[PDB]
Amino acid sequence: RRETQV
Amino acid sequence: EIKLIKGPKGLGFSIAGGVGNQHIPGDNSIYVTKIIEGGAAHKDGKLQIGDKLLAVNSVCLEEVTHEEAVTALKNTSDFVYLK
Numbered sequence: 001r002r003e004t005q006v
Numbered sequence: 007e008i009k010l011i012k013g014p015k016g017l018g019f020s021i022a023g024g025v026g027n028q029h030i031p032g033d034n035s036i037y038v039t040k041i042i043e044g045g046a047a048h049k050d051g052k053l054q055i056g057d058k059l060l061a062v063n064s065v066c067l068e069e070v071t072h073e074e075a076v077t078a079l080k081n082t083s084d085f086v087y088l089k
Contacts (some may be wrong), residue, residue, distance in 0.1 A: 002072045003022040005015075006023055006079040 008052035009086040017079065017086065018045015019053065026073030034069045035059070053088065059089035 010017055020040040023029035027038050036059040041048050059067050062078050063086065070078070 002027045003020060003025075004072070004076050005020045005042075006017055006076060 008050070010046050010050055010088060012047045012082070014084055016045070017088075018042045018047040018049075019074060021059065021072075024075050025069055025070045031053045033041050036067050036070075036072075037074045052060070057089075061087075062089075064088050 019038050019042065021036050021071065023034065023036040025034040027032055035074045038053060038055055038059065041055060047053050047065045059075070061067055063082050065078050067078060067089075069076050
């Protein structure tokens with residue numbers, strides 16, 4: 001499960 | 007098309023989604039899950055949580071891996087064109 005800060 | 011001047015650490019928003027990590031079942035799109043307070047995105051308005059990202063400096067993001075979308079968003083100068 002991947003959620004990323006951009 | 008939302009134009010943004012990237013700031014110190016970034017565009018100022020977070021993403022989920024992408025092939026191999028479907029945010030919504032059967033969908034590989036990249037969705038904006040968070041808008042950091044005071045980041046460039048916030049201050050500039052135009053983008054909000056839930057928006058589906060289409061492109062970055064027209065590198066289409068419709069169906070790419072999560073990491074490809076990350077890189078696509080890290081490797082774009084101080085000037086950036088969104089979706």
